Design a protein around this ligand. Sequence first.
Ligand SMILES: *[C@@H]1O[C@H](CO[C@@H]2O[C@@H](C)[C@@H](O)[C@@H](O)[C@@H]2O)[C@@H](O[C@@H]2O[C@H](CO)[C@@H](O[C@@H]3O[C@H](CO[C@H]4O[C@H](CO)[C@@H](O)[C@H](O)[C@@H]4O[C@@H]4O[C@H](CO)[C@@H](O[C@@H]5O[C@H](CO)[C@H](O)[C@H](O)[C@H]5O)[C@H](O)[C@H]4NC(C)=O)[C@@H](O)[C@H](O[C@H]4O[C@H](CO)[C@@H](O)[C@H](O)[C@@H]4O[C@@H]4O[C@H](CO)[C@@H](O)[C@H](O)[C@H]4NC(C)=O)[C@@H]3O)[C@H](O)[C@H]2NC(C)=O)[C@H](O)[C@H]1NC(C)=O
Ligand SMILES: *[C@@H]1O[C@H](CO[C@@H]2O[C@@H](C)[C@@H](O)[C@@H](O)[C@@H]2O)[C@@H](O[C@@H]2O[C@H](CO)[C@@H](O[C@@H]3O[C@H](CO[C@H]4O[C@H](CO)[C@@H](O)[C@H](O)[C@@H]4O[C@@H]4O[C@H](CO)[C@@H](O)[C@H](O)[C@H]4NC(C)=O)[C@@H](O)[C@H](O[C@H]4O[C@H](CO)[C@@H](O)[C@H](O)[C@@H]4O[C@@H]4O[C@H](CO)[C@@H](O)[C@H](O)[C@H]4NC(C)=O)[C@@H]3O)[C@H](O)[C@H]2NC(C)=O)[C@H](O)[C@H]1NC(C)=O
Lengths: 209, 209
Amino acid sequence: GGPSVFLFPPKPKDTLMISRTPEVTCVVVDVSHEDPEVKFNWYVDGVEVHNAKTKPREEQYNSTYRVVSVLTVLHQDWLNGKEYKCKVSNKALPAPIEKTISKAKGQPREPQVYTLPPSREEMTKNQVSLTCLVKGFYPSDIAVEWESNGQPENNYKTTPPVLDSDGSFFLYSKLTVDKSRWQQGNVFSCSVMHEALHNHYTQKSLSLS
Amino acid sequence: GGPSVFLFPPKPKDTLMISRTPEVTCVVVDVSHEDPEVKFNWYVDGVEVHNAKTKPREEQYNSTYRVVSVLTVLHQDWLNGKEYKCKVSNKALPAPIEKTISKAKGQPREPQVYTLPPSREEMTKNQVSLTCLVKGFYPSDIAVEWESNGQPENNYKTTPPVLDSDGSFFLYSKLTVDKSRWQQGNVFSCSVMHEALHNHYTQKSLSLS
Ligand SMILES: *[C@@H]1O[C@H](CO[C@@H]2O[C@@H](C)[C@@H](O)[C@@H](O)[C@@H]2O)[C@@H](O[C@@H]2O[C@H](CO)[C@@H](O[C@@H]3O[C@H](CO[C@H]4O[C@H](CO)[C@@H](O)[C@H](O)[C@@H]4O[C@@H]4O[C@H](CO)[C@@H](O[C@@H]5O[C@H](CO)[C@H](O)[C@H](O)[C@H]5O)[C@H](O)[C@H]4NC(C)=O)[C@@H](O)[C@H](O[C@H]4O[C@H](CO)[C@@H](O)[C@H](O)[C@@H]4O[C@@H]4O[C@H](CO)[C@@H](O)[C@H](O)[C@H]4NC(C)=O)[C@@H]3O)[C@H](O)[C@H]2NC(C)=O)[C@H](O)[C@H]1NC(C)=O
Ligand SMILES: *[C@@H]1O[C@H](CO[C@@H]2O[C@@H](C)[C@@H](O)[C@@H](O)[C@@H]2O)[C@@H](O[C@@H]2O[C@H](CO)[C@@H](O[C@@H]3O[C@H](CO[C@H]4O[C@H](CO)[C@@H](O)[C@H](O)[C@@H]4O[C@@H]4O[C@H](CO)[C@@H](O)[C@H](O)[C@H]4NC(C)=O)[C@@H](O)[C@H](O[C@H]4O[C@H](CO)[C@@H](O)[C@H](O)[C@@H]4O[C@@H]4O[C@H](CO)[C@@H](O)[C@H](O)[C@H]4NC(C)=O)[C@@H]3O)[C@H](O)[C@H]2NC(C)=O)[C@H](O)[C@H]1NC(C)=O
């Protein structure tokens, strides 16, 4: 086992907002001292591209090198399902290692977003759970956040996406708030970003009624 | 190179029900045709034990073999946190490989179980989502099922456990039913099995209210 290669996608948010900078990152670890030269070749749908930004090798504490190449992707290319190939050549290798990444193949499907209030039986407790259910989406690349009054609500966790029986995905996000904030009629909102949403955004709010 | 070893815990349900048979599983992959024969030794807190069963092997489509030992464990041994060690010996591998596993450590904490009805917004669809929020539990080993009129309801998916900010875990389980069944006022219940519950079991009901 000479070097190993890991190829990382853009963050889901980066491909959905034109203001952001989506990237694919090709990382090569366990490059030896005896064969330290690394060459990257990058292909987009199998055609070679020359605009990647490759950093100089960095020696790790375990006396091997780590080398990183970063390819900027166009938002619409990623969303049109183009395939990104990183080919890594090194003299310790019997053959160059190739890795490919893309958005998961399939027709995109819009997330249905539903907000659910706390159970009345949780209403004895000091802190209470506000739920956002996001279902029927494809592919599973998605981002979820909570706000109240224009401001990020930081006490939330989101489940990974889960493959549903019809082939789409779902998840839940849980915001935890002090009981009293919920009593006071505060409006909380769950926001979702996904390629199949109009403007890649929807928001759903939830309040005591 | 040679074979490599992966050691797997019992299913949560199996350890919590005395009628069930919990098993620790030692899976050996990359076993070649040229070097075929694998030995297993098994240990429970260092004391060698002798109850253990090798499965008939599988030929993988990469032309390597997949060999499996299965050790039956006592429910209370697993729950009291005893260590299970799998020592794999293959004389075309530099030395014997040992792997060890046990229950996650720390004070078990009781799950809080809340059922949530479908969103008002969801009530215009043909199928609706019944939600069971299970939070505050430790360790993350748990089982969740659904029933109606003492009969299993099978069209559900449960998220993996998620680490909450207090070091406990939560998850959600989603049952999908025909809106018809829901509107007619059928009772549905979410069953939860976890070591910290009395009798390792609780159920919460959900009907049109
Ligand atoms: C020598 O040391 C080096 C360096 O390590 C460092 O130094 C040593 C001495 C120690 O101090 C050590 O602690 C230090 O870290 C060792 O190098 C490591 O080698 C291992 C393998 O041996 C690598 O393991 C893989 O890791 C992947 C995840 O890596 C990320 O997350 C970890 C922590 O969780 C980080 O440490 C990494 O840096 C990676 O972090 C990610 O980096 C991306 C690129 O920068 C980020 O994306 C970019 O981020 C920016 C902003 O941040 C933008 O957003 C960009 O647009 C964006 O692209 C990303 O944000 C960041 N994430 C996080 C969370 O930080 C694992 O994915 C991978 O698992 C796969 O492979 C396994 C087999 O190898 C397999 O078992 C797994 O199942 C998994 O398989 C994949 O599964 C999916 C399906 O689910 C499939 O899609 C894939 O096909 C499939 N892949 C397969 C089959 O290959 C590995 O575990 C490790 O990353 C690496 N470290 C570093 C730092 O590079 C080296 O091992 C040592 N050597 C020896 C001999 O000791
Ligand atoms: C030749 O073929 C075989 C088999 O081929 C495979 O299957 C067939 C049918 C085809 O579809 C193929 O396309 C497919 O490739 C290959 O053998 C595979 O080899 C890899 C390693 O190279 C193994 O990966 C490990 O997997 C375990 C988890 O595996 C479970 O889940 C899999 C589904 O995701 C499932 O396939 C497995 O069978 C297994 O399933 C469980 O099995 C038990 C008993 O049957 C059962 O009770 C469970 O219910 C069941 N569970 C589920 C969910 O299904 C994974 O844990 C390993 O990850 C660790 O190690 C990695 C390094 O390899 C590392 O990157 C990870 O981070 C992780 O590391 C650990 O992390 C923990 C926790 O964080 C930490 O404490 C530790 O420090 C750390 N430990 C270590 C040791 O590092 C790992 O990924 C495959 O299981 C295996 N496939 C099968 C079917 O057995 C073989 O590679 C091929 N060979 C060649 C040369 O090509």
